C-alpha cells in the first residue's frame, strides 16, 4: 500500500503468489506451473521496492543480486562433512527455494558465465551435478521475478525493443510477462505522487 500506481504489476504479482496447476506428462515430462515476470524500466521507478515486498509477504523467498552471485553459488557446491568425513553437496540459492520464489535484482549486470546456469533452471527446473564423483539431479521448482535496466540510462522509444534490452532472446523467451515501465513528466501525476510520498514520510 506504500506504492502509488502500478496496478497491473501488482495484479501479476498476486497471480504469481497463486501459481498454476502443474501437469505431469508422459516421456518423463512436466508442464511448469510457475509464472515468471521481468520488469524493465527507468531509474527510480519502484522496481526494487516490489521485490523487497515479495521477499516479506511470500512464504518462501530468496534474494539475489546480479554482480554478487556465481553459478556455483546458485545451483550447488561440493563441500566436506567434518564430523563424519565424506564429501557432500551444499545447496545453492535456486535449489533452496524449491516451491518458492527467487527475486533477482540488477539482472542485466550478471556475467554471461553466471547467466547460463539460470537458463537451465528456467527450462528443465532441474540441476545436474557431475563433479568430484557426485552424479546427481536436484529438484528446483521456483518462480522468478526479476528487475533490470535498459542498455542506456533510460528507455528509448525511437529505437527497436531488442536494442534497448541487452538480454539474449533465449533468456527473454522464458518469462511469462515482460513489463516495460516509463516515467513520464506530467504536472497532475507529480502533484499526486509528491503528496502521497510526503504523506508516507
Amino acid at each position: 500500500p506504500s506504492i502509488y500506481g502500478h496496478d497491473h504489476i501488482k495484479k501479476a504479482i498476486l497471480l504469481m503468489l497463486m501459481g498454476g496447476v502443474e501437469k505431469n506428462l508422459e516421456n518423463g515430462s512436466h508442464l511448469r506451473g510457475d509464472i515468471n515476470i521481468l520488469m524493465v524500466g527507468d531509474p527510480s521507478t519502484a522496481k526494487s521496492q516490489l521485490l523487497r515486498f515479495v521477499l516479506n509477504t511470500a512464504s518462501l523467498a530468496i534474494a539475489t543480486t546480479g554482480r554478487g552471485s556465481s553459478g556455483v553459488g546458485l545451483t550447488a557446491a561440493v563441500t566436506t562433512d567434518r564430523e563424519t568425513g565424506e564429501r557432500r553437496l551444499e545447496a545453492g540459492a535456486m535449489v533452496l527455494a524449491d516451491r518458492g520464489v527467487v527475486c533477482i535484482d540488477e539482472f542485466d549486470k550478471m556475467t554471461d558465465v553466471d547467466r547460463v546456469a539460470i537458463h537451465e533452471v528456467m527450462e528443465q527446473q532441474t540441476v545436474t551435478i557431475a563433479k568430484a564423483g557426485i552424479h546427481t539431479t536436484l529438484n528446483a521448482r521456483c518462480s522468478v521475478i526479476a528487475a533490470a535496466n535498459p542498455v542506456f540510462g533510460q528507455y528509448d522509444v525511437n529505437r527497436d525493443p531488442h536494442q534497448n534490452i541487452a538480454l539474449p532472446d533465449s533468456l527473454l523467451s522464458r518469462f511469462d510477462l515482460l513489463f516495460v515501465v516509463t516515467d513520464d513528466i506530467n504536472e497532475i501525476r507529480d502533484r499526486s505522487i509528491s503528496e502521497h510520498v510526503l504523506r508516507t514520510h
Binding site: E187, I188, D190, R191, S192
Partner: protein, 86 residues
Amino acid sequence: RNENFQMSITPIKNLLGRDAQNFLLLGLLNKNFKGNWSLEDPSGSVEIDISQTIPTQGHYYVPGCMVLVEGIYYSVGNKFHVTSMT
C-alpha cells in the same frame, strides 16, 4: 481574522497541479514584464484574465493594491480565469 472567512485563501503555488476547482487568491494586482495583468503573493505569481470579470462596484481597482479574487485555474496554459473581484 475576518468573521466571514474561516472558502479560505490559498497560496498561489498550490495551484500548479490542479486542473479544476475554485480558489480564493489574495495578492498584488500589477502588470508582468510582458504587459499582461497578473497577481503576485510572496509564494509566487500568476497571470489573470479579465475578459469575463464582474467586479463589486463601490470602490477603486488601481494597480498596486491588494485584491480578493475568485475563479478557476487552467493548466493547459497558466491562467486564473476570474469570475469575481473585491
